[PDB]
C-alpha cells in the first residue's frame, strides 16, 4: 500500500511539476524520486488480474531515466516524461482497480491482488516516499 | 614501460595435454598362503599404490590428499586424443592397440605369466581398439583400477575444447566492431569440422576489487591506463605549431613593451602536448582512472580550454580538489567579471562546486545553461554485450555540446565587464576568440574523442567501474589547449589490428584473473573441507596475486591477503575442480587404506584373539574394523597433549583402540608372537607422553616364518592380544579392470582466433560516427 | 581470596571489536559536510586502514585478554585500583604499530614464565607479610617493655 | 608481525599525506615498527596487571 501510494504520489508530482519552462531546481528532487522509481520497477513483470470483466493486463518496465541536463524544462523533455508517466499511471490505476475488486475474510487488510503482493517485497521499498495523505 | 611489458606479456592460458593415464594403483604379484599358512605355488595379483608415500598422522594424511588434489588438478587435461597414448598389444589377435603403455606392460606381464589362466589370455587376445571414423570416435582397451578409471573417465568426458568454425571466429570479434561500418573484415580459410578451440573464462569480477581493495584497484586501473595509452591512436596532420603560434600572435596583438596576460596564452603549445592530452583523456576514460588538473591561474587560455574540457569530459573523472580549483578560476576570471558579479567567495569543503553556485547565481541563460550541463554531465552506466561500460552523453558523442559552450562563450564576449579595466575584457575576448576561431575543429575533436573512446571501449572485457582511484593521472590544461589549437581535419581511428591487440590483451588478463581465482578458491575450499586447521592460507593468496602478474606482493600486507581469502572463500568452486575434489573425497579413505606404510590404528585388547586368515598374509593380527572397542583419537591427543585418559587406560589394562595413521613393524616370527611382543610397545606412551613414536607390531605368520613348524605341528591357530586396524589389498581382476576409453579420433586445436581475421579500415575521410555522419567535417 | 580486575566478556572473546568496526565503517561513509575533500579522503582512508584489519584486531584483542588473564592468575596480592601519582606514558603511535602490525601468530606465556611470575609474586607477598610481622612485633615489644 | 615496510607503504599510499598540506608530513608515520608494537603490547598488559 505504501509502495503503491508512493508510486501514485510520484506520478502525481511528475504530472503537476514537469511542465514546460520550469526550473530544473523546481523538479530536481522529484526527478531523483522518479528515476529511483524507474530503476526499481525496471525488469519487473506484473499481471493485473482477470476477476470479473477486468481485462488481464501484462506490464513490463524497460524505461530510460529522466534527464538532468536542462536548466529549464523544454517541450521535448515534457513529452518524454509524459510518455513514461502515462504508462506508469495506466499501471497504477490497473493495480488499484485489481485490488479494489478483491476481498478476503481471513486477512482483509493484507493485499489481495498479485501485483500489490509483489510490490510488498523489500526490493520495492526504495520507491517509498512522502506519505502525507 | 615495465607495466606495459608485464600486462602484454601475459599469455592466454597454457593448454594441458594428457600423455598417459593418471594412475594411483598398479597390479603387483604377491605370494598367497593356504588357510593354514602354507605357501601356495601360485601367486596372486593385487592392487597396490604406485607411489606408496603416505605419511604418519591423520592431519598429515589430509595434507597428503590436499597435495594429491593439487597433483590431479595439475594433470587434468584441457583435451585428450587417445591415439597419442595408444601402443601395440603384442598378444592382440588382431595386432590392435591399447592405452596407455602402462596398460600394455600389465597385459604383457599377465599374458606371459605361467600362472595366468587361459581365459585371461583369451581376454587379452581380444583387447583391441575400434575406430568409428564417421563419428570421429575411437575406443581403446585399458587396464585401470576403479579409482584410476573414474579419474580418467572424468578427464575424457569433461574436455574444454569446443567445435571451431568460421562463424565462431567472426563472432569472437566484439559486436560493436563488427557493427561498425568503418571496418571491413575478411577471412581466407574455411576451418574444418575437426577444428577446436578453448573458450576464455570471461566471468565478471567475483572479488569486486573495485570495492574496498583500493591499493589493488589502483594497480589494476594503472595497468589498464598504460594499456589504453598504448592503444590510443596518434594524431595525424596536426596544424603546424609554428604557423598556429604565428596566427595566435596575430589574433592576440602581442605588444613588446607591455606586460600582457595574453602572452601566457601561448605557453605549452606543441604537438607532443596535444597528442599527450588526447591519449590521457581517452585512456583515463577507458580505464576509469581519476584525472587531476594541472594549470596556472594566470593562463586564461588554460581556463577557456578547461571550459571545453569540463564540457566534454564528465566531471567525476577528475579529483574533486582540482576540478573545484579549475571551476573557481573559471568563475572568478571569466564569468563573474564578465557580468560584473562580486568575486565568488568559495569555501574549501563546500558541498556544491563553484559551477553549481554560479549556475544558481547567473542570470544569463546561455551561460547558466552551459553551467547546468557541466554540473550534470555524467557517464551513463550501461551493460553492453555483458560488460559494464561508461557511455558518454549523446550530445557529446555528436559534438553538439560544443555549440552550447560556444553560445555561452559568445554571451561572455558580449558583456561589458563593468568593474574591470577595458584591457581585462580585451584579454578575455582574445582568449575566447582563440577558442571560437576553431569551433568546427572543436566539434570535430569532440566527435573524434568520443568515437575513439567508444570504439576502444568495445574491446574491454572486464566491467568498467567508476570509482575514484587512490592516485590520479595528471592532465595539464596547456595540453588541452594544444589539442584544441592544433587538431586538424585528419580523422584518426584505431587500427583493426590495434583493436584486436587491445581486445586480446584484455581477454588474456581477464581469463588469467578468472583461472587464478578458480585455483585459489578450489585450494581454499579443499583445505577447509579437509579440516586443515593448522594451515595458514596466506601462501595461497600470495601465489594468486603473484600469478596475476601485475601486483607487487611485497607491498601487499597480510591483512589484505586475508580479506582476499575471505572474499574467495565465499565463491563456488569451478565445476571441473569441484568434481575432481569430490572424487578425491569419495576415494581418499580407500586410497589411504591401500598404503602399506601406515595402519589406520591399533586395538589393545587384553584377551587372546585368533589371528585372521588372509591369503596374502597367512595369519595376521589385523582388525577389519573397530567394533566393540572404545576409540582414542590420536590426532586429538597430539593436538591437546593431554595424556590422562590414555595413561589411565594403559595402566588399568582397559581395552581400547588408538585410532590414527600409524607406522607399523611387520614381524614374521612365531616366537615373537608367542613372546607377546605386540603387547610391549605401548608402555612408552605412559613413560614419555608421546604417541608419534608408537609403532604397533603386525604379525605375518606363514610358511616363510622361520619357526612355522610350531603352527604346523600343534594344530595351533595363532592368537594375539593386539590387532592392527588395517585393510587387506583388493585382488587384481584383469577382466573387471578392463575399460573401453572413448575419445575423438583426431582434431586440431587453435589458440589465436583473430589470426584468421584480416581487417582494414575505410578511408578516414569517410569514417562515420554513431550518427552516420563523418566523424570530422572541416575543410 | 585475591581481588582481581577482570574484563567484560566481549573484550575477552574480541566480539566488541566488530562493534568498533561497525562504528568506524559508518565514519568512513560519512560526508564530513564542511571538510576539505582531500583531508576527508585521508581521514576516511585511515579509518578504513583500521577497519579492514577487523580479523587481526579481534585476534589481537583476544590475545591481549588471554595473556592478561593467564598472568593475572599468578597474582597473589589484591589488585587494588587507584589513580597513581605518576603514570606510564603510552604513545598512541605504539598503539598504531600494534594495531597495524599484529599477525596471526599466537603467543601465550610459557609455563615456566608463569611459574616464575607466580613465585616472584609469592615471594614478595610473603616477605611483605613477614616484615610486617617483624615490625609489629618489635613495636609492640618496645611499647610493652616501656621503651619510651 | 606484518612486514613494517609493506604496512608502511600501504599506509602511505592510502593516507596520501604528501598530497595534503600537513605541516608535519614526516612525523605522521614515525614510530610505526615492530619494537613499538611489542612495547605497546607489554605496556598494556603490564599496566593492567599492576
UniProtKB/Swiss-Prot annotation, chain A:
Q: Where is this region: Interaction with the inner capsid protein VP2?
A: 62-73
State where the protein is found.
Virion
What about PTM? The N-terminus is blocked. Sumoylated with SUMO1 and SUMO2. Sumoylation of viral proteins seems to have a positive role on viral replication.
Q: Which family does it belong to?
A: Belongs to the rotavirus VP6 family.
Q: What else is known?
A: The VP6 trimer contains a zinc ion located at the center of the molecule. The zinc ion is not essential for either trimerization or transcription activity of the DLP. Zinc-depleted VP6 has an increased sensitivity to proteases.
Please describe what this protein does: Intermediate capsid protein that self assembles to form an icosahedral capsid with a T=13 symmetry, which consists of 230 trimers of VP6, with channels at each of its five-fold vertices. This capsid constitutes the middle concentric layer of the viral mature particle. The innermost VP2 capsid and the intermediate VP6 capsid remain intact following cell entry to protect the dsRNA from degradation and to prevent unfavorable antiviral responses in the host cell during all the replication cycle of the virus.
Per UniProt, subunit arrangement is: Homotrimer. Interacts with the inner capsid protein VP2. Interacts with the outer capsid glycoprotein VP7. Interacts with the outer capsid protein VP5*.
Protein name stated in the entry: Intermediate capsid protein VP6
Q: Which organism is it from?
A: Rotavirus A (strain RVA/Monkey/United States/RRV/1975/G3P5B[3])
Q: What is the lineage of its organism?
A: Viruses, Riboviria, Orthornavirae, Duplornaviricota, Resentoviricetes
Amino acid at each position: 500500500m505504501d509502495v503503491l501510494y508512493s508510486l501514485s504520489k510520484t506520478l502525481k508530482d511528475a504530472r503537476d511539476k514537469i511542465v514546460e519552462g520550469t526550473l530544473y531546481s523546481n523538479v530536481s528532487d522529484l526527478i531523483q524520486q522518479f528515476n529511483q522509481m524507474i530503476i526499481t520497477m525496471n525488469g519487473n513483470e506484473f499481471q493485473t488480474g482477470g476477476i470479473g470483466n477486468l481485462p488481464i493486463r501484462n506490464w513490463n518496465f524497460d524505461f530510460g531515466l529522466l534527464g538532468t541536463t536542462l536548466l529549464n524544462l523544454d517541450a521535448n523533455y515534457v513529452e518524454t516524461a509524459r510518455n513514461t508517466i502515462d504508462y506508469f499511471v495506466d499501471f497504477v490505476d490497473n493495480v488499484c482497480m485489481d485490488e479494489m475488486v478483491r476481498e478476503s475474510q481471513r486477512n482483509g487488510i493484507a493485499p489481495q491482488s498479485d501485483s500489490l503482493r509483489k510490490l510488498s517485497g523489500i526490493k520495492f521499498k526504495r520507491i517509498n516516499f512522502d506519505n502525507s495523505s | 614501460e615495465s607495466i606495459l611489458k608485464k600486462l602484454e606479456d601475459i599469455k592466454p592460458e597454457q593448454v594441458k595435454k594428457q600423455t598417459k593415464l593418471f594412475r594411483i594403483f598398479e597390479p603387483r604379484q604377491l605370494p598367497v598362503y593356504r588357510a593354514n599358512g602354507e605357501k601356495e605355488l601360485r601367486n596372486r595379483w593385487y592392487w597396490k599404490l604406485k607411489r606408496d608415500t603416505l605419511p604418519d598422522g591423520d592431519y598429515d594424511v589430509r595434507e597428503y590428499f590436499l597435495n594429491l588434489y593439487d597433483q590431479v588438478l595439475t594433470e587434468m587435461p584441457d583435451y585428450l586424443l587417445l591415439k597419442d597414448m595408444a601402443v601395440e598389444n603384442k598378444n592382440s589377435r588382431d595386432a590392435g592397440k591399447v592405452v596407455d603403455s602402462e596398460t600394455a606392460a600389465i597385459c604383457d606381464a599377465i599374458f606371459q605369466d605361467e600362472e595366468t589362466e587361459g581365459v585371461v589370455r583369451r581376454f587379452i587376445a581380444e583387447m583391441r581398439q575400434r575406430v568409428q571414423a564417421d563419428r570421429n570416435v575411437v575406443n581403446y582397451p585399458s587396464i585401470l583400477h576403479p579409482i584410476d578409471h573414474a579419474f580418467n573417465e572424468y578427464f575424457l568426458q569433461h574436455q574444454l575444447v569446443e567445435p571451431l568454425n568460421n562463424d565462431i571466429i567472426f563472432n569472437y570479434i566484439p559486436e560493436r566492431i563488427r557493427n561498425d561500418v568503418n571496418y571491413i573484415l575478411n577471412m581466407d580459410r574455411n576451418l574444418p569440422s575437426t577444428a577446436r578451440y578453448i573458450r576464455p573464462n570471461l566471468l565478471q569480477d567475483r572479488l569486486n576489487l573495485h570495492d574496498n581493495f583500493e591499493s589493488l584497484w589502483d594497480t589494476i586501473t594503472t595497468s589498464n591506463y598504460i594499456l589504453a595509452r598504448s592503444v590510443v591512436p596518434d594524431l595525424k596532420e596536426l596544424v603546424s605549431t609554428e604557423a598556429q603560434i604565428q596566427k595566435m600572435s596575430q589574433d592576440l596583438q602581442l605588444e613588446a613593451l607591455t606586460i600582457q596576460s595574453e602572452t601566457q596564452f601561448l605557453t605549452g603549445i606543441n604537438s607532443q602536448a596535444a597528442n599527450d592530452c588526447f591519449k590521457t583523456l581517452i585512456a583515463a576514460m577507458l580505464s576509469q582512472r581519476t584525472m587531476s588538473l594541472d594549470f596556472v591561474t594566470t593562463n586564461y587560455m588554460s581556463l577557456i580550454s578547461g571550459m571545453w574540457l569540463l564540457t566534454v569530459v564528465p566531471n567525476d573523472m577528475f579529483i574533486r580538489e582540482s576540478l573545484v580549483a579549475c571551476q573557481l578560476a573559471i568563475i572568478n576570471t571569466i564569468i563573474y567579471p564578465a557580468f560584473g558579479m562580486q568575486r565568488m567567495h568559495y569555501r574549501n569543503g563546500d558541498p556544491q562546486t563553484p559551477f553549481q553556485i554560479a549556475e544558481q547565481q547567473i542570470q544569463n541563460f546561455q551561460v547558466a545553461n552551459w553551467l547546468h550541463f557541466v554540473n550534470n554531465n555524467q557517464f551513463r552506466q550501461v551493460v553492453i554485450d555483458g560488460v559494464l561500460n561508461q557511455v558518454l552523453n549523446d550530445n557529446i558523442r555528436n559534438g553538439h555540446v560544443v555549440n552550447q559552450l560556444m553560445e555561452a562563450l559568445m554571451q561572455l564576449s558580449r558583456q561589458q565587464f563593468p568593474t574591470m579595466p577595458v584591457d581585462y575584457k580585451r584579454s578575455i575576448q582574445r582568449g575566447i576568440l582563440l577558442l571560437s576561431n576553431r569551433l568546427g575543429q572543436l566539434v570535430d575533436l569532440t566527435r573524434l574523442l568520443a568515437y575513439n573512446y567508444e570504439t576502444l571501449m568495445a574491446c574491454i572485457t572486464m566491467n568498467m567501474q567508476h570509482v575514484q582511484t587512490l592516485t590520479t593521472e595528471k592532465l595539464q590544461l596547456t595540453s588541452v589547449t594544444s589539442l584544441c589549437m592544433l587538431i586538424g581535419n585528419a580523422t584518426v581511428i584505431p587500427s583493426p589490428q590495434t583493436l584486436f591487440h587491445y581486445y586480446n590483451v584484455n581477454v588474456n588478463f581477464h581469463s588469467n584473473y578468472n583461472e587464478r581465482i578458480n585455483d585459489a578458491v578450489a585450494i581454499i575450499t579443499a583445505a577447509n573441507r579437509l579440516n586443515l586447521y593448522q594451515k595458514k592460507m596466506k601462501s595461497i593468496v600470495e601465489d594468486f596475486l603473484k600469478r596475476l602478474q601485475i601486483f607487487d606482493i611485497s607491498r601487499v600486507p597480510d591483512d589484505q591477503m586475508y580479506r582476499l581469502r575471505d572474499r574467495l572463500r565465499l565463491l563456488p568452486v569451478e565445476i571441473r575442480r569441484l568434481d575432481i575434489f569430490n572424487l578425491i573425497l569419495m576415494n581418499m579413505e580407500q586410497i589411504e587404506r591401500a598404503s602399506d606404510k601406515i595402519a589406520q590404528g591399533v586395538i589393545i585388547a587384553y584377551r587372546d584373539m585368533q589371528l585372521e586368515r588372509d591369503e596374502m598374509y597367512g595369519y595376521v593380527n589385523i582388525a577389519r574394523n573397530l567394533d566393540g572397542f572404545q576409540q582414542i583419537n590420536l590426532e586429538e591427543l597430539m593436538r591437546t597433549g593431554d595424556y590422562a585418559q590414555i595413561t589411565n587406560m594403559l595402566l588399568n589394562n582397559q581395552p581400547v583402540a588408538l585410532v590414527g595413521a600409524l607406522p607399523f613393524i611387520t614381524d614374521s616370527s612365531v616366537i615373537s608372537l608367542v613372546a607377546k611382543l605386540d603387547a610391549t610397545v605401548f608402555a612408552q606412551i605412559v613413560k614419555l607422553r608421546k604417541v608419534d613414536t608408537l609403532k604397533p607390531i603386525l604379525y605375518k605368520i606363514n610358511s616363510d616364518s622361520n619357526d612355522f613348524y610350531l603352527v604346523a605341528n600343534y594344530d595351533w591357530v595363532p592368537t594375539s592380544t593386539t590387532k592392527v586396524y588395517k585393510q587387506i589389498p583388493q585382488q587384481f581382476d584383469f577382466r573387471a579392470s578392463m575399460h573401453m576409453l572413448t575419445s575423438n579420433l583426431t582434431f586440431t586445436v587453435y589458440s589465436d582466433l583473430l589470426a584468421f581475421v584480416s581487417a582494414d579500415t575505410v578511408e578516414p575521410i569517410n569514417a562515420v560516427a554513431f550518427d552516420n555522419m563523418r566523424i570530422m567535417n572541416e575543410l
